[PDB]
Symmetry: C5
Subunit: 326 residues, 5 copies
């Protein structure tokens, strides 16, 4: 067949390690575009972002050149990348042992020498996230692609400006929206430059899981702690009520500590609210113990009334602040 | 032997990367049928479906052509796929790093050129599931198979209409039933088309695990919360009973939050019932605290009677609604 | 040396994909015997059985044939399986991504053409288990070995009847005993037959872990629930005692739900006993609340006496039934 | 260079599968010595021992023979094992899917034909452990190395008696000391013998983790249970104290069951002590309930005094026995 | 092209296993420098340090030698390491099964024969850590690189003194600072020396996670235990308050035991503080039980006053000591 003829012709002496430049003072312009098809997860416990997508490679191999008229058309031809040269472009913030692709067995080569690859992949990428508004947090995770072997004088990583589009994924957790990728240049020993593309995706947590697990038991334990100072001290049920709030808030803290990551810069607002509720139970237990201590003078109810007034107004302020965060 | 003769004959110049078309404007029709032998698990915590089954490949390789009379019969012959051409057909929603097969070492080739492969595999597939009726939920998970390298003008993925059958698996968890697969066409840059088969399987959770773990302690804690307002307030056991319900419902919430996934769109009905029970304990604690607060006028029992009446009728309505869900 | 001479002689034109039959209407009889050396674990949470053992292959390769007198003896010779033909026999219920062996680098070939392989392996096998008597359960897990590529007309999987022996392993968990393997024939599209061996091993759980963790706290919480109705109602300690049983039985339920698998057909007897204890605490709390409700007529002790009598006799019946299960 | 000359000379016709014997009735003596550099962990939950060390291979390859005077010295030469013959010696109790080495890329070959390998490795080995003295337990785990392909008539596994040394590792968990390795011979079908070395290492748990987590809360809950019968029954705080001990001992039991393995032969002494404390709380709750039951004759304090006396003397006996275990 | 000419010239007879020395009594000086770009995690539960960085190899291959004037410049050339010799330098304390690189597909070779490699990698390294000041602990973890095959007489591992720089990473967990690497020489059978570089990095935990999870509930439970002896004994709420502290401190202990590793040498200060709080609750429960025991002479308040005085002054001493640790 004619498809075997050009394949045996233009791969008769091809070496997969030779950089395809006609002159020694020349580079190859490798065009990249990462496109996410599905954001799988954002594991903040280990600061990884698991995602699925395809990275569009496009370079210009001048050694694979022919005219279609000698082969009766056939502009497109498909070669595995194990027999042609490929640029070593990997993630700059890879979060696993080795970088592997889902499909990497074919690459489209045109008659003008330009080569497309498009290997689909599952990318685990490190991305910095600040949990100062957990779980009502808007995020931004970056994927950095580039060459760690070839410098700028060997290859040139270029974004494609012909498709300056933006896309969105309406996940049930994250309302993922994309940011226009840019090129940022990393140096090496202040002489050699190692270029690379950077692509941000702006995650936005729209969750009903973390609200139901963390927001509503914390505000209801706050409600019970506010209901506590109407209990009269001379029956001996206020102290066991307070220690029940202590145990329930300890269980809620253990929930939160199981879910909140170690890799933490600032305290989340749900954690600060839970700490406020926990120390509020402590202060109310102090007031109950003092009240029953001098109950053995009996004009205690105005102290509990002003304590409920202060805790009511400050709890309304704190809850309104957390609602303004949401 | 004669089996070596045709193998050395029709693989004397075979290239595994050449697409087997006689004309350049021709495609190869690859027939697919996925068949599940056992659905292993549906991990909704990570939205994956682990299953075991074999995917039936069938294409037409015109380069492997011979007559049996020159080889004294032997219509069937078995070649490993590492020496012949195979289509790059993978899952469109694969949920692991790389796509691998359990057995992929043989493929049946006939004298008419048609090639069967049948590689058995363990497929981890992403599938969307809405847990609005957990755990009495009927589901539907899809397996999408197709080529991410060859377009429609190179290969053509075709369902086989000769076997339009349906099957079922009677698992102890899922009553798995199958749906007639169809073909859905995915586009690429609005010019190149990338076809593929889609196969739905309709899962149905028939579980006694999640009922015993979640349904019966929630309804029994509801029963205890309904029994609560018959306790007289002037003994100081109602408040510790209410905080015991608070701690028990917190433990049940921690059970549920351990089992309910983060990847959540809507709240499950067991979660809504547990939240209703938890806020019912909150309202009953408010009423008990108010009652013992003005116990220091003594006609409290009619308020507790009407409170039990309202909680009884609304609890019967909610439990009847959850039973109508089941 | 003479060992290289026959190796270069009878592998001078050997193809590893040719099925070794002299006539086209002939099969090769591959003799199998799986032998377990150690049953590692039975993970019922994922329905897998991890085991270690060697599978004894034995077939008849007529292409490796020589007389010892031309090579001065040397009946035994050892060839890696990468250079000779091997049958593609795998597990029919494999529970991992790919089937791999611990040692697969040598195979013994005799002068009569018969070939032994014996690759040792760690097998993860799916096996159906019914937990209707957890944890006093006698089990049976099956290992099915066969070819998914070669049919009956290509290879023939045969058990060896020369060694019809039975063995046993005295593990600290499982008293593992073996069952005589048999041959069961699986069909494919009702025309092609795909044979295979099946080997059952009869596990028997003899555990002191699950007894100490689950049986004794459940029966002691039953003992405390039986001790509950001797508490007089007019002191207000019966209700907090009952809610303490509620919280303790909730903790025990959370233990059991952590250990009991999701993949569940029937409720275990320890789970049914725990549910019975939990609803017994519910009924006793109902009776205590009613008693203290009409304590505000004072002839309550006969009701508690008959309640203890009914709960005593039915608890003795249930505990005797669970002991008869053991 | 001269280093390439002998490498091309004595590997000009080398086959990596030929067993290096001049006569057919001859074996090769492969000398083994495993040396542990660091014991990583002893996971008793899965009965594995993770360790790091190098296994010293030494055999006599008569096919790699030369005199140094023809190559101007160069007695030592270094060949990768992929081009020379190596004996297939693996662990007899391997605890992973496949046996792999950390470094296996070089092997030292001398001019006398003797070959050293020394591949460093991370070994996961099954070893039997009896937890009858957890966590004050002295242990012994074995590493068995041998050939599962070559029998005694092919290779001969030999310990080296020139280095009959013993070593020790002072870990913060295990005071690891080594035992002089010996040779134990395993049979196969009572005709073929499969030899192998066995090496015991005597672990000794010197832990402050398991003491602080398990020993001190159990003995302090024992202390609280002993303090319980001084509470007078006519205040209704003894029953809630006893149910608080029930809940605390249930939490401690859940700690222990999370840490104690399923793979259990005998109950640990900490588990027996916790069960004794738990049933002691049960007996004390029975005595408190009986006392408050006939409190409605008032000479109860001598019964509580003799009960404290019996529980004191038997608790001192049990604690002295557990201290004598330590 | 000219780039293929020298590649075919100086690799026309290259063997990848020959050590590149002109004389037999010569070594190759391999220059190493590990550089960390990001410290991923320090898992003290398994004593591993996961990090990302590149290790700078530099050796002198005299077999790859040419002048640029015969090839019109081109001093730099890039060869994959699979076709040239590379030194077998691995981690001496590797914490996984096999040592693999993220990128290892290229290596820069100059016209003077010196070869750079720079493979980026994710290193899991064992490092000793003493948790005597958890979580306010300054740490030091070491990475040891060297050859386990080539001795000092074959290769020579050398640090590069031209870059004696120090760097720092401002993580949200660890304020990572680097230490000047040195060379330490390991012996083998007291005759052969096996050199290697060692590089320390000085970690410093600056966390708000472990403080909020462990420090504040322990000090607040200490605060509640200090508030306990103002409760009058003749109401029967002191004992249930003490058992509530017992249950809350048990939950906090279970938090800590879940987070504190088994691999423990000394008790952490948070663990010692929690044990002190737990035994303080025990002593206060003893004093409350004694007080209510002889309440049935009534001058008890001075004993509780001196007990609060002693517990106040010793708690201030302990908390001031833990603050001086911080
Ligand atoms: C790489 O391509 C960009 C595209 O604009 C260009 O600006 C830059 O100079 C190029 N780098 C080179 C030629 O080294
Ligand atoms: C692929 O096969 C289907 C089968 O009906 C056909 O409808 C479709 O046109 C084919 N696609 C081509 C030929 O591009
Ligand atoms: C396979 O071997 C068994 C052994 O008895 C025999 O019964 C069966 O007929 C054989 N199958 C064939 C020859 O297809
Ligand atoms: C293997 O070596 C040991 C070393 O003493 C020897 O006793 C034994 O007989 C040898 N086995 C043979 C030669 O089969
Ligand atoms: C290795 O290099 C160091 C660098 O100073 C040198 O001191 C040492 O002697 C060398 N080792 C040899 C030549 O064996």
């Amino acid at each position: 067949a004619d498809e075997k003829r050009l394949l045996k012709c233009i791969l008769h002496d091809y070496d997969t390690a030779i950089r395809p430049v006609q002159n020694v003072s020349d580079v190859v312009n490798v065009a990249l575009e990462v496109t996410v098809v599905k954001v799988i997860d954002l594991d903040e416990k280990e600061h990884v972002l698991t995602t699925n997508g395809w990275i569009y490679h496009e370079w210009n191999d001048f050694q694979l050149k022919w005219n279609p008229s000698d082969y009766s058309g056939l502009k497109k031809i498909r070669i595995p990348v194990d027999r042609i040269w490929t640029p070593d472009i990997v993630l700059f913030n890879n979060a696993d042992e080795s970088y592997r692709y889902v499909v990497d067995k074919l690459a489209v080569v045109y008659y003008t020498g330009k080569v497309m690859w498009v290997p689909h992949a599952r990318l685990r990428s490190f991305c910095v996230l600040d949990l100062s508004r957990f779980p009502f947090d808007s995020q931004m995770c970056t994927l950095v692609f580039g060459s760690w072997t070839h410098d700028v004088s060997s290859v040139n990583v270029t974004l494609r400006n012909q498709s300056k589009v933006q896309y969105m994924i309406d996940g049930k957790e994250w309302q993922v929206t994309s940011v226009q990728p840019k090129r940022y240049q990393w140096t090496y020993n202040s002489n050699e430059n190692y270029a690379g593309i950077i692509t941000g995706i702006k995650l936005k947590r729209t969750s009903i899981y973390y609200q139901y697990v963390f927001i509503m038991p914390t505000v209801l334990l706050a409600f019970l702690t506010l209901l506590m100072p109407f209990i009269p001290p001379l029956g001996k049920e206020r102290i066991t009520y307070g220690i029940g709030l202590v145990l329930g808030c300890t269980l809620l803290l253990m929930m939160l500590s199981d879910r909140m990551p170690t890799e933490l810069g600032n305290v989340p607002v749900v954690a600060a609210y839970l700490a406020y509720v926990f120390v509020m139970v402590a202060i109310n237990l102090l007031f109950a113990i003092m009240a029953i201590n001098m109950s053995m003078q009996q004009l205690t109810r105005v102290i509990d009334r002003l304590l409920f007034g202060s805790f009511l107004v400050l709890t309304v302020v704190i809850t309104i602040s957390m609602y303004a965060h949401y």
